[PDB]
Every structure is written in structure tokens, then in C-alpha cells.
């Protein structure tokens, strides 16, 4: 199968036997995708072992894969295992089981169900400040993901279930301590390597009850959801799963935990990591931070409480969040498995090929963005948003399988940014790694953690 | 009793004695609420005779009335009589009777019972195309609500009872269309609303607003006819045989009149916006190639079709207003509302507010796109109401209408007919309808 892209006349790096091109990942997915886009142009192919991966960068073709031909051709992502009972998780589900679950979990993030969560998040916004004030009253660096990680946990545990689990901290909370080591795709680990480079050992590992999420983490979270599921008010992610489990049919008990673990993860890890990138950029661009602070005070004078409506009114904040996501799309890539032979936009694609959208590369392509390395929130002004293509800039994906928690993620991060910049300013402190080095490993994180100085206003 | 809104400091137009403000309805309910929305902003109160009506536009206040404090304070709509045996209908009943019926008829539109009706509807979707093709191969302008109203009668008499009858001169469509005619210049509907203190005179006199021998053509037909009918006989074996017919009168009128009128409102906008009709015709051929028959699932995938239906129902909300009767003194969202006031949600005026809609008069299905769907408050756009007393057939109507719209744009395109009223003039009468009947030229593909 290593002669596939030569057959189709599609350029790409020459693959080694067995390994394919995975050796080229020594700088990470992101540097590999940039170089290949520069070397080969609009379309190229490579192999993750024996798995052909076709990378597409054309906006029309991307819309076909992500939106037009989703339900019929590009329905699922690259198979990820061994996962055990977590195969029922929405992000991992396939075909009919995914359609069932997506529809069932959509009503969790309506503008009505979101509006109902601002007062709940309004509790832990003030808590995030009080923990910040302590580290501010005394000259000392502040690791942001710890304090952002704590905030995220409280926000996902109470809006989806109704359970306050972090009493002002309580910094050694078992939820965060177990959830951070939930999945760490270390490519140096022979495990995630051999899974990718020889993706036929999953069935063995599955019958051996081996899982990519450690057992004590899955157990602790599994015990807790059974401890949370009693419910004997407001309809929440726990209620939407329980009212329909009580009523084809239906939602299982090991399935109801699976969706909770997915939500519990993304709510904690994705939110806190993007919040760190933002604050790093504001601290390294004081003009942008002052301008954002100037906007927050105009919309919310006297440190007014942020509301659902006032969050959406702030134009510069939305630009700051978007430009950061442009530079740091935490998904790095978007993938879809081609389930049958298709010829999209005049290009034949055979069954079984994974179609990959190099999001990180597209977000930094000079042919789409001026000075793509520079942090310029003005790209996303309404004056300039004409020249921004929704299929080049896809930080939450696109189409029927985009980020289901997008609106929740943006509001939770915006509510956090408002109540923080309302009370503090952020300066570098030399131990701040400048410029920021990105983790040359699997997921999108920095090398050294983000540490900043916090001053009170 | 006319100095109420003056006491509470709530703005409003001055009431004439006995009449109140009902002389401003000469332009219809819709134009009155919009005039009031501009002059008296946010909240105002007027009078329907001796009946004070508080019009609220704040979406949080709308949510309190429609959802939060529904079961408690705002359970019942405005009193409507004389009704007779029709007092037992779900839309007219109150409190306890409403609760037992709202739960009883809710299983009619579960995701299961609603998927059972797809092969029942898919038969009449070919008689509609075969009847339009006789008037399309000939260059004859088609009156849309006629051929539509026929399709709406079959679907409701076969998804609720299981009897195939309609489709031309059908006795059901004939008696159903004249079931109620709220002409506001008829001295009947005017007075009993303005001077309602004579309603119980007509109630003890066995008088009713619905025609006697129109209620009889439908009272004996149900005695003649798992679906909607079956779901009620199983609980009957305290549902009486009089309250049973009351519900069939509701489902048949709604399933016929409400479906046909909106579909005509849809077809009018698609003809006036060819770039919208063509863009919708290209989406139906992609999810359903070779004119593939539409199923339950292929309907929910079509996004533009939903954004067209939602933009029409924004423009033409056939209910115009939502109403709840405040049953005790309350102070909701920082405002005293006494007992007996009718709280009114001006659905038509809200669906065209420039504060919530840009270029509202213009038809743009792009307001409901997933990118712009975020900007839509679910208490400003409430074409089916909201809360525990919303439209029970909303999920049924949203599917049934979309089932009709798909089987038509696969075979025919629609152009104006010169005699088509452009722009469409709304009926300055009572209900929401066009003045002249909608007519369009039908060209086959
Ligand atoms: C800054 C924060 C976040 C970003 C940038 C982000 C990004 C993404 C991306 C790129 C995808 C895949 C889209 C595609 O394949 O086209 C996705 C999917 C998903 N996201 Fe997020 N996400 C964030 C936070 C969250 C949160 C807070 C939740 C809470 C539940 C969440 C839940 C999910 C789920 C369940 C999926 C799977 C979608 C499916 O398969 O149906 N994400 N997200
Ligand atoms: C486009 C079509 C339709 C629209 C826009 C519509 C609109 C509405 C509205 C606004 C309400 C009142 C909500 C409130 O007061 O808060 C309602 C209630 C109701 N609708 Fe519909 N309707 C439609 C079609 C139908 C259909 C097809 C049926 C079939 C049976 C139906 C049966 C009912 C009934 C029985 C009620 C009263 C329920 C109650 O009072 O508890 N409607 N509808
Ligand atoms: C096969 C490869 C790897 C090539 O690809 C994929 O199939 N891996 C993902 C499916 S395994 C992952 C299971 C998990 C659970 C708990 C903690 C860690 C991992 C998941 O389900 N994670 C999505 C749910 C949470 C989330 C994360 C980020 C943003 N929002 C929500 C598919 C996938 C889904 C959604 C977003 C993704 C972003 C980046 C990479 C993959 C993504
Ligand atoms: C007191 C006023 C008038 C100010 O107000 C109300 O109380 N009148 C309605 C209750 S009398 C009406 C009885 C009827 C039956 C057969 C044919 C004509 C009339 C009804 O039951 N009609 C609802 C049932 C069908 C339907 C219609 C439209 C949309 N969906 C379903 C209350 C009411 C209920 C539901 C929807 C309404 C829409 C517009 C106006 C009133 C509505």
C-alpha cells in the first residue's frame, strides 16, 4: 500500500517500510504538516505505518469532507484504541451510534441551557480571583494551568451534574489529580508509537482488557458518576441522559459514564490550555491587554458581574480569543476516514484513506494570513472578517461533527477572562519562556509551563 | 376598571369607555402591537373592552410566564366562550383537566409514534405531485391553499385515525374550513370579547361559538372512525365520549388549516426569492439523488430547509400572540402583575423587532444558519409558544410541513403569475392570512 499516492499521482515524502513516515514526527505533527505543505503544495499524502493519510488544504474540498459528505462518506475519525467501554463515547463512536448520541447530547448546549449556566460559573469566577489575589499580594510567579485547571473542573462538574466538588480548594482534588493523567499521548512511549506504526495490536490489547486510559483513573471516575447519579433540580447533562435512560432504546450505565468522562476531560484540559495561551499573549502584548481591559470596563463598569448578553457584546475579547486559537489550535489536525470510493472536487479518494485537514498549517499559511506568526487581534475585526474563510480557520472543526462544546468552551473561557482582567494585569517574569516553545511531542502544549507575574489593579 | 395601567405606572394607549382599545384593531392585531412596540417601549398595557392586557417583550419575563411560573401562575389562556362540550379541549381546558390531557396526548408525538407516520404520509406526497402535474402541464395558475389544504386533510385523518378519504369537493375540508371565522367586524366576536359579562348567558342557553351542524358533521364522523385515536380508546377502556370528539376537532382543524397556510407562505417567498428556491432545490437533490423518496432521517439533515421554514414562521407566525392569564398577584422580574391580567407575548411584533433582527422586513433564511443561530433568543422567536403549554404538535407540524416541501421542489419550480399579490398583503382581519389567495405558476422540471 506504500505505492498508493504514486499511483494516484499525489506527492508526498517517501515512506520507509513498516514505519511509513512516522520518523518525520520528531519535530511534532505541526512542523511536519508545515514543511509538507511548503514542499508539496495544496495536496499531499503520507503513511502512518501502513495507513495512507491524504492531506487536503483546498477550502472547497474541506467543505465537502467536513460538511457535504459527512453523513455519507466522511462520518468517522481514525480508529482509536484500545478503549474498552469508552468505545461508546461520542467522540469515538461511529456511524449510527454516533448519530444517536449526537442528537441526544445536542440539547445540553442550547443558548437557553448555556444562559442558565452563567450564574453557576459566576460562582467559580470569583473563586478563581480569590486564589489569584493570594498569589498577587505577594510577589511570586503563578502557574496558570493549575489555577485554570482548578477553575475548569468546577465549571464542568456543576453545570453537567450539579455537584460542587472544589470548595475554594482543596488543591489536592482527586478529580483533577486523576483527570490530568487521563491521556498523555507521548509519542516517545513505545505504546502510542506501536499503536500508530503497527495498528494491528488493538484487538489483542482489547481482549486483554488493556486500555489507553489507566484503570485507576477510569475506576475513580466510574465510581464517582455512580455516586453522582442518585438525583433524588435544573435539567442538566446528567438529566438529559437520565430522563432518556428512563425513556431505539436506550442509554446504558457504562455508556452514561463514557459521555461524562469525555465532557469531564474536554471541560478541564482544553479550557485550561487555551486560557494559558491567551494570557501568555496578553502578557507579551500589553497594548492588547490594556485595550481588552478598556473594553471590559466600558461594558462592565464598577467590576459589574458578567452576564450571558454582555459576554457576547464584547467585540475585542472575541477577537483576542479567536487570534489565540488561530496561533494555537489545540486539535492540530482534523481527520475523517473515507468509508467508500469517492471523487470529490475532481480527485478520486479510495476507501479506507484518512483525510486530514492540517489546521495548524492552514492557520499559519502566508497565502491566507498576513504575518501569520504575529499575534494581531485585528485580523478578526468586523472590518477585516470578510477575508477570513470558515474552512481555513477551523479551531472547533466544521459541519455535523464539529466541537459540540464550542459555545460552552468560548463562554466559559470568556467568563474566566473577564472576571480576571477585571481585577489583575499580567506581566512576564523572565522565568516566563519567551518566545514560547511548543511541545515537540503529541498534543499541543508548551515546553515549560506558562508562568507570569500577577499585579492587582 | 380602566385606570389599572395608570395605577401601576405602565404606559399605554388611552381606553375609550366600554370599548377600551379595540378600535385600534382596524389594522389588525399585528399592526397594533408593532405600533405599540415603537411608541411604548419594552412593556405596555391596553384593554380589550374591560379586559386589561399586559404586553411583555423581555425574554426573561417571557420565560418566567411561559416556563418557570407556568404551572403556578400563568397556567391558562384567555377565557373563550361560549363553548359547550368544547370546554374539554386541551387548548381551552384549565388547570387539572389540562394536566391530565397534556400528558395523555403527549405520547402521540414521541419519536416512535412520529416515525410510524412516515409511510402513511409518503403516499399522499405522490397524489400532490400528480394533482399539480395536471395543472402544471397546462399553463394554469394554481391556487396554492386548495391543493395544499387537501394534502393537509389526508395526513391528519390518517395519522390520527387511519382513514383515507380526501383527494376535490371533500366534505371534511368543506366543514373544517368554516369551523371558525373570527371576523372582528362580526358583531358576535367583537362584543363577547369587549362585553364578556354576557358569556354565561349563552352558556346556560346551550349556545356555542362553533356552528352547530359543523360540530355535528365532525361529532358523528369520529363516532364512525397505535395512533392518536387508539391512544385515547385505551385510556377510555375519566375520558368521556364527548371530550374525545373535542380533541379530534382540534387536531383536524390545526393539521389542516395551520399546515396549508404556512406552506402557502413558504411557496410565496420561494417564488419571490428564486435564489432561495433554487438554492433549496439543489440541496434536496444532493441528499436524495434520482428523486429518492425522503425518509424520517433525510429530513433532519437538510439545514437550509429548516432555515427556510424558520424564517417564514418568523415572518408569518400564524398565532400572532401568546396569552396567559395571571391567576394571582405576582411580582416577576421586578414588576407587579395583579390577578386577572392577561399577559400577552406579541410574537409577531417580536419576530420583526429591529433590536433583535437586522433588516427584519426582508426574507433571509440566513438568520437561522448554524453560524448565526447563536444570535437568536428562544423567547423572542416563539412561533410554537414555549414552556409546558407550547404547541403539542410542534414536532409533528415541523416534520409534516417539511415532508411536503421536499416532495415538491424535486419536481416543480414556482414563479409569480402577475396576478400573484406581490408584496403579499396580510389579512387586516382577525387570523393571519393573505387578502387575495396566493396563486403561482408551476413549471415542471
Ligand atoms: C478551547 C476549547 C475547545 C476546542 C478548541 C475544541 C475543539 C474541538 C475540535 C477541533 C473538535 C473536532 C471537530 C472536528 O473533528 O471537525 C472537537 C470535538 C468535540 N469537542 Fe471540543 N473543543 C474545546 C472544548 C470542548 C469542551 C469544553 C467540550 C465539553 C463537552 C468539548 C467536547 C467535544 C466533543 C464531545 C467532541 C466530539 C465531537 C463529535 O465527535 O461529535 N470540547 N472539539
Ligand atoms: C405551523 C404550524 C403551527 C403553529 C405555528 C402552531 C402554533 C401554536 C401556538 C403558538 C400554540 C400556543 C403556545 C402557547 O400558548 O404558549 C399552539 C398550541 C397548540 N397547538 Fe399548534 N401550531 C401549529 C400546528 C399545530 C398542529 C399540526 C397541531 C396538531 C394537533 C396543533 C395543535 C395544538 C394544540 C392542541 C395546542 C394547545 C395545547 C395546549 O393548549 O396545551 N398545532 N400551537
Ligand atoms: C485516532 C486519532 C488519535 C488520530 O484521532 C482521534 O480520533 N482522537 C480523538 C478520539 S479519542 C479521545 C479520548 C480521550 C478521552 C479522555 C482524555 C483524552 C482522550 C477523545 O475522544 N477526545 C475528544 C473529547 C474531548 C475533547 C478534546 C479536544 C477538543 N474537544 C473535545 C478524536 C477527537 C475528537 C474531538 C476533538 C479532538 C481534538 C484533537 C484530537 C482529536 C480529537
Ligand atoms: C381567547 C383567545 C381567542 C384570545 O385566545 C385563545 O385562547 N384561543 C385559542 C383557544 S380556542 C380555539 C378553538 C378552535 C377550534 C377549531 C377551529 C377554530 C378554533 C383553539 O383551541 N385553537 C387551538 C387549536 C389548533 C391550533 C391553531 C393554531 C396553532 N396551533 C394549533 C388558544 C390557542 C391555542 C393554540 C394555538 C393558538 C394559536 C393562535 C391563537 C390561539 C391559540
Tab-separated table of C-alpha atoms and ligand atoms in Angstrom, chain B residues 48 77-81 83 86 89-92 176 179-182 193 209-210 249-251 253-255 258 318-323 383-384 389-391, ligand 4:
chain	number	residue	atom	x	y	z
B	48	UNK	CA	-59.900	44.550	25.236
B	77	UNK	CA	-55.077	31.230	28.228
B	78	UNK	CA	-57.721	33.927	27.878
B	79	UNK	CA	-61.270	32.705	28.643
B	80	UNK	CA	-63.017	31.740	25.405
B	81	UNK	CA	-66.754	31.109	25.296
B	83	UNK	CA	-68.118	26.662	24.004
B	86	UNK	CA	-65.794	22.051	23.586
B	89	UNK	CA	-60.425	20.530	24.650
B	90	UNK	CA	-56.769	20.752	25.648
B	91	UNK	CA	-56.441	24.287	24.265
B	92	UNK	CA	-59.486	25.511	26.237
B	176	UNK	CA	-63.359	22.208	8.514
B	179	UNK	CA	-65.201	25.778	11.582
B	180	UNK	CA	-64.269	29.224	12.905
B	181	UNK	CA	-64.206	32.663	11.265
B	182	UNK	CA	-63.065	35.355	13.713
B	193	UNK	CA	-64.718	39.876	23.805
B	209	UNK	CA	-69.295	29.815	19.099
B	210	UNK	CA	-68.751	26.844	16.792
B	249	UNK	CA	-61.893	18.766	16.266
B	250	UNK	CA	-58.641	20.361	17.445
B	251	UNK	CA	-56.178	18.058	15.665
B	253	UNK	CA	-58.516	21.936	12.262
B	254	UNK	CA	-54.874	22.511	13.206
B	255	UNK	CA	-53.446	19.784	10.981
B	258	UNK	CA	-52.258	25.627	10.019
B	318	UNK	CA	-49.917	32.220	12.481
B	319	UNK	CA	-50.649	32.610	16.207
B	320	UNK	CA	-49.606	36.300	16.220
B	321	UNK	CA	-49.724	36.385	20.036
B	322	UNK	CA	-49.194	34.174	23.064
B	323	UNK	CA	-51.528	34.642	26.024
B	383	UNK	CA	-43.719	30.523	16.714
B	384	UNK	CA	-44.982	27.499	18.686
B	389	UNK	CA	-48.178	24.818	27.300
B	390	UNK	CA	-46.382	25.121	23.951
B	391	UNK	CA	-47.705	23.641	20.712
C	4	LIG	C1	-59.383	33.741	23.817
C	4	LIG	C2	-58.475	33.931	22.592
C	4	LIG	C3	-59.245	33.692	21.290
C	4	LIG	C4	-57.999	35.396	22.610
C	4	LIG	O1	-57.301	33.085	22.571
C	4	LIG	C5	-57.484	31.721	22.759
C	4	LIG	O2	-57.470	31.243	23.878
C	4	LIG	N1	-57.691	30.967	21.586
C	4	LIG	C6	-57.348	29.536	21.494
C	4	LIG	C7	-58.411	28.635	22.219
C	4	LIG	S1	-59.950	28.414	21.187
C	4	LIG	C8	-59.606	27.533	19.555
C	4	LIG	C9	-60.819	26.689	19.197
C	4	LIG	C10	-60.967	26.373	17.739
C	4	LIG	C11	-61.185	25.069	17.297
C	4	LIG	C12	-61.324	24.782	15.943
C	4	LIG	C13	-61.250	25.796	14.998
C	4	LIG	C14	-61.025	27.092	15.429
C	4	LIG	C15	-60.887	27.380	16.780
C	4	LIG	C16	-58.389	26.630	19.753
C	4	LIG	O3	-58.366	25.768	20.624
C	4	LIG	N2	-57.226	26.716	18.949
C	4	LIG	C17	-56.022	25.906	19.059
C	4	LIG	C18	-56.021	24.514	18.367
C	4	LIG	C19	-55.438	24.415	16.942
C	4	LIG	C20	-54.237	25.281	16.631
C	4	LIG	C21	-54.325	26.521	15.997
C	4	LIG	C22	-53.184	27.279	15.733
C	4	LIG	C23	-51.941	26.775	16.110
C	4	LIG	N3	-51.810	25.576	16.725
C	4	LIG	C24	-52.936	24.865	16.967
C	4	LIG	C25	-55.899	29.299	22.069
C	4	LIG	C26	-54.818	28.866	21.120
C	4	LIG	C27	-54.200	27.657	21.286
C	4	LIG	C28	-53.188	27.209	20.414
C	4	LIG	C29	-52.766	27.957	19.361
C	4	LIG	C30	-53.370	29.212	19.148
C	4	LIG	C31	-52.921	29.982	18.049
C	4	LIG	C32	-53.475	31.201	17.804
C	4	LIG	C33	-54.491	31.673	18.655
C	4	LIG	C34	-54.925	30.936	19.719
C	4	LIG	C35	-54.380	29.666	20.007
